[PDB]
Amino acid sequence: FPRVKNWEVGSITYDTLSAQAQQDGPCTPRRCLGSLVFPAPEQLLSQARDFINQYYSSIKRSGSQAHEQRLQEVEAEVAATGTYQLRESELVFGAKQAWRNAPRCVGRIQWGKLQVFDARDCRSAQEMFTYICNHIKYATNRGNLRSAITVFPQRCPGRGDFRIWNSQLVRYAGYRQQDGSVRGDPANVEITELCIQHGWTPGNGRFDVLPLLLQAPDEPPELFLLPPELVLEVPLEHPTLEWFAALGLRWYALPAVSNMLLEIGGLEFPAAPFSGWYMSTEIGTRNLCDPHRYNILEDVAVCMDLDTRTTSSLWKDKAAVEINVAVLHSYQLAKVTIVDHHAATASFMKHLENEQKARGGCPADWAWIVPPISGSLTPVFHQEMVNYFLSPAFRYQPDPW
Amino acid sequence: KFPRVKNWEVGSITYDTLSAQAQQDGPCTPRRCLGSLVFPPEQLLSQARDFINQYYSSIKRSGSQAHEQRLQEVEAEVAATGTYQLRESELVFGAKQAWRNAPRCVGRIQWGKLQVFDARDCRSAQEMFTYICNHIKYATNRGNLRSAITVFPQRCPGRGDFRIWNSQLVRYAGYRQQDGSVRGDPANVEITELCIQHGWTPGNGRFDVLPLLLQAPDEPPELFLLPPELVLEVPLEHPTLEWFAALGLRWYALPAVSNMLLEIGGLEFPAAPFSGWYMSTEIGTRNLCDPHRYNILEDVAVCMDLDTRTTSSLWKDKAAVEINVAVLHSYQLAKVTIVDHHAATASFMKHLENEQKARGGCPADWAWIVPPISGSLTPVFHQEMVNYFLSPAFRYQPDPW
Ligand code: HEM
Ligand code: HEM
Ligand SMILES: CNCc1cccc(-c2cc(C)cc(N)n2)c1
Ligand SMILES: CNCc1cccc(-c2cc(C)cc(N)n2)c1
Ligand SMILES: C[C@H](O)[C@H](O)[C@H]1CNc2nc(N)[nH]c(=O)c2N1
Ligand SMILES: C[C@H](O)[C@H](O)[C@H]1CNc2nc(N)[nH]c(=O)c2N1
Ligand SMILES: [Cl-]
Ligand SMILES: [Cl-]
Ligand SMILES: [Gd+3]
Ligand SMILES: [Gd+3]
Ligand SMILES: [Zn+2]
Numbered sequence A: 001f002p003r004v005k006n007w008e009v010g011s012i013t014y015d016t017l018s019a020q021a022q023q024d025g026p027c028t029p030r031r032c033l034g035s036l037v038f039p040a041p042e043q044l045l046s047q048a049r050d051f052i053n054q055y056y057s058s059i060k061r062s063g064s065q066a067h068e069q070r071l072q073e074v075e076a077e078v079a080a081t082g083t084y085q086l087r088e089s090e091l092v093f094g095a096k097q098a099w100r101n102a103p104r105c106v107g108r109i110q111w112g113k114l115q116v117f118d119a120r121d122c123r124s125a126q127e128m129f130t131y132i133c134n135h136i137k138y139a140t141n142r143g144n145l146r147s148a149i150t151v152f153p154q155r156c157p158g159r160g161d162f163r164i165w166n167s168q169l170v171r172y173a174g175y176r177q178q179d180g181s182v183r184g185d186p187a188n189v190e191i192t193e194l195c196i197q198h199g200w201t202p203g204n205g206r207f208d209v210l211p212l213l214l215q216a217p218d219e220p221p222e223l224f225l226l227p228p229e230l231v232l233e234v235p236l237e238h239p240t241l242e243w244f245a246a247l248g249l250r251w252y253a254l255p256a257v258s259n260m261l262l263e264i265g266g267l268e269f270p271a272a273p274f275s276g277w278y279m280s281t282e283i284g285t286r287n288l289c290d291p292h293r294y295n296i297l298e299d300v301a302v303c304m305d306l307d308t309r310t311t312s313s314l315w316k317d318k319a320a321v322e323i324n325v326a327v328l329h330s331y332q333l334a335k336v337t338i339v340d341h342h343a344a345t346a347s348f349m350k351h352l353e354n355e356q357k358a359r360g361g362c363p364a365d366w367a368w369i370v371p372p373i374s375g376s377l378t379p380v381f382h383q384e385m386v387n388y389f390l391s392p393a394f395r396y397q398p399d400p401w
Numbered sequence B: 001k002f003p004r005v006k007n008w009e010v011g012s013i014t015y016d017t018l019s020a021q022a023q024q025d026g027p028c029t030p031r032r033c034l035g036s037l038v039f040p041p042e043q044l045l046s047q048a049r050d051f052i053n054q055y056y057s058s059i060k061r062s063g064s065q066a067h068e069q070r071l072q073e074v075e076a077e078v079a080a081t082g083t084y085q086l087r088e089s090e091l092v093f094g095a096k097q098a099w100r101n102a103p104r105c106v107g108r109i110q111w112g113k114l115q116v117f118d119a120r121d122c123r124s125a126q127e128m129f130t131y132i133c134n135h136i137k138y139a140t141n142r143g144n145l146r147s148a149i150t151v152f153p154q155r156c157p158g159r160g161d162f163r164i165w166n167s168q169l170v171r172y173a174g175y176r177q178q179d180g181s182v183r184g185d186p187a188n189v190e191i192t193e194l195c196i197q198h199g200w201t202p203g204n205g206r207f208d209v210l211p212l213l214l215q216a217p218d219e220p221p222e223l224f225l226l227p228p229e230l231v232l233e234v235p236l237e238h239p240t241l242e243w244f245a246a247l248g249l250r251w252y253a254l255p256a257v258s259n260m261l262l263e264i265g266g267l268e269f270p271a272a273p274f275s276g277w278y279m280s281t282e283i284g285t286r287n288l289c290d291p292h293r294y295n296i297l298e299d300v301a302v303c304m305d306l307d308t309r310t311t312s313s314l315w316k317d318k319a320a321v322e323i324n325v326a327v328l329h330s331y332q333l334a335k336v337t338i339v340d341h342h343a344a345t346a347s348f349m350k351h352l353e354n355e356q357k358a359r360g361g362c363p364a365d366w367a368w369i370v371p372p373i374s375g376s377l378t379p380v381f382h383q384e385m386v387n388y389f390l391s392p393a394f395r396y397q398p399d400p401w
Helices: A016-020 A041-058 A065-081 A088-100 A125-143 A186-197 A242-247 A280-289 A297-303 A315-333 A341-359 B044-058 B066-081 B088-101 B125-143 B186-197 B280-289 B297-303 B315-333 B341-359
Strands: A003-005 A012-014 A115-118 A148-151 A174-176 A182-184 A212-215 A222-224 A233-235 A250-252 A261-264 A267-269 A393-395 B004-006 B013-015 B115-118 B148-151 B212-215 B222-224 B233-235 B250-252 B261-264 B267-269 B393-395
Touching: A041 A065, A041 A088, A088 A115, A088 A148, A088 A261, A088 A393, A115 A125, A125 A148, A125 A212, A125 A222, A174 A186, A182 A186, A186 A212, A233 A315, A242 A297, A250 A280, A280 A315, A297 A315, A315 B315, B044 B066, B044 B088, B088 B115, B088 B148, B088 B261, B088 B393, B115 B125, B125 B148, B125 B212, B125 B222, B186 B212, B233 B315, B250 B280, B280 B315, B297 B315
Parallel strands: A115 A148, B115 B148
Antiparallel strands: A003 A012, A174 A182, A212 A222, A233 A250, A261 A267, A261 A393, B004 B013, B212 B222, B233 B250, B261 B267, B261 B393
């Protein structure tokens, strides 16, 4: 039982829940690969067996009537069909659980407040698009963001997968330039190219929202433009730096990850976009200041009159902090839910406590939980963490192209 | 079986073949990752053999002349005495290699530049004290700091240990009150309690330099007052916040770790204090701003008239950048060697590349290499890293009581 210390307080707990870690991660006793970003009917049965166990624990009916039947049902169905179907309530609980179990989500205090849209009856790319618009619409909620997920039909033998090719429902075009550079988001050069290849008429702005590439089973992907009024964006300004609005920067309201696979009791949902609300550092530090992203840090520091010729002046730190200020302020001004890294990490500390009393631990990826600026200013820095894989889960999956 | 290591800023890929050598098992298993945790007879011959084969290959002297020779005399030395003494050059090569291998050290680009004082003929606490004082005054060098390690005698059974009871050679006092709370440094409250418990007159202030507790073999330890002229300190002021000086903050010039156990060729020196120069975030972020440390963040923010009423003002972030600016400013004004986290991480990237060329990898603890402020602003953040144990090494060790 791994012992876990909080260095800010001296707290000490033992993560007994790690002992249930089913699937294996990348670390050995030889080498730690923690920092790496990217680490059969009977097995379907034990996964399903376990998840059903899980589900019946949660409804306080463990080992009860419905519990036995569901096991024998699932086994008979797996025997008969090679697979099985989740009941709707099992599906709501397996999507909440998969958010609960997501080691790299600091926003997991919210894991129970999750709106699950059952789209498992989806039939085409076109219906898929409609479900997705209603997800975006429900979640955005005019800026009062709501956590939601739409579960599209599960992988099953005989039919290809549903896939959202886009890594997120809202992404900014990244056009490779004349002179070898990128206009827009360099992280989205590939998906932009695929859109163009699939007949998207590209723009030439820095914040061109991408179309959706939606793959119905055994179909080429299909291109769907998002209605501009569905995609609530936030123009970026600074509460005191008034030249900041002249940078033309924007970010969108809704972080909806669309390329992850949702796993529940051995069943695989290759298309299940989920959305919450942003933590300002993702936008302010990562998205705008990563050297491989919008990379605005030097331009802001130059505009800020900072001395960018020496690193000891901390012009990077100063300019980044005001970019994050701008993001927070711009989102409050626009009445769009946003959580700063101080508030987010402090509720994650409550999550770890709730999770310790609830499950004897909580899977947590320190390098992803700790914010990318002001790390030790937040309490999660001084919290040791045990990272491991629980199921249900959101997993990475290969890109379908 | 060769870890793929990516850098996400550039896209470059390397493989850590060096990870194949890992001796002492790490804390991580396929089922859980514990990398974020801080403190997770003739066996001597295996480690002895390996270290000697290292040395000679490093001087391009594999399989010739003194190689087989030196192998015999340690085969004979252990045969006769059950231990062995290091050739002066080997103790130097082992000290440099331990530093080279310290995964958590971000300043290893400097690893080839190290001064080894040989205190292996040490006897009595009064002896170490002058050895330490020689080191200190050598390392300090009037502010133009020079890396140094003083290696005190190795370990043998039936004898006590050489131990410096302090964690560092320069540590600040920490005193309790009629209400438990601490004046001074709470990270040293315990050793501050020992120093008084061994007959030291306690001061009043928040920056009293503690006396050393030096321990000779099989002997209770002796108090030592460091020469005040030998403890180079930097009064902390801020380039443009004239009141920062008034806050009365200081830190010492020399970061000298005096509680880790140097381990070369299977020899264990429980007293081998090493020292370099600081990186400014050690002082300005961890030492002054950690809530369990000097915890000055809110004080500085009040003086800056920041809005401490809301977390989203990023007042914590703003006051922390300024505390770091003061540290860098004050050390530079005092002409004390110090390196900012940007310069430091950038050199570490340079180091990783050197080590990829030299030894095909570099053990690196991601969570300790990424600085505690402005993480993703430094390149090491975007660099994947592999953590493993190589020999020779610096190890943690129990408190000598
Ligand atoms: C409601 C507020 C939420 C907040 C504030 C939040 C915050 C975050 C942050 C900051 C990350 C790190 C991503 C990065 O740094 O690039 C993350 C990752 C993640 N989140 Fe949350 N999140 C929220 C909601 C959700 C929801 C609703 C789900 C699922 C239903 C979810 C599942 C995940 C997953 C699976 C990851 C890992 C994705 C990856 O590894 O790239 N999160 N979250
Ligand atoms: C010359 C400039 C140097 C710089 C800027 C530097 C910087 C650092 C920093 C920032 C850490 C993180 C420790 C913490 O934050 O608590 C560290 C750890 C460490 N350093 Fe270096 N260091 C330097 C030289 C050296 C030397 C000369 C040695 C030994 C010969 C050394 C050995 C270590 C070890 C063993 C650790 C890990 C200690 C632990 O885990 O507590 N460093 N260093
Ligand atoms: C820089 N963020 C990229 C990224 C990558 C992966 C996940 C997110 C995410 C997802 C959700 C549901 C909320 C949130 N706040 N973030 C974001
Ligand atoms: C707040 N850091 C405490 C700490 C803990 C452990 C080591 C250091 C250290 C050691 C050396 C040789 C240089 C340096 N710059 N740091 C510092
Ligand atoms: C290379 C390194 O692991 C990588 O940049 C990680 C570090 N920690 C992170 N943490 C979060 N939350 N998001 C990220 O994208 C990353 N990136
Ligand atoms: C809990 C966490 O592992 C712990 O606070 C570590 C994280 N990274 C660190 N990094 C450095 N350089 N120094 C530290 O003390 C720590 N503390
Ligand atoms: Cl994002
Ligand atoms: Cl220190
Ligand atoms: Gd103005
Ligand atoms: Gd006034
Ligand atoms: Zn690990």
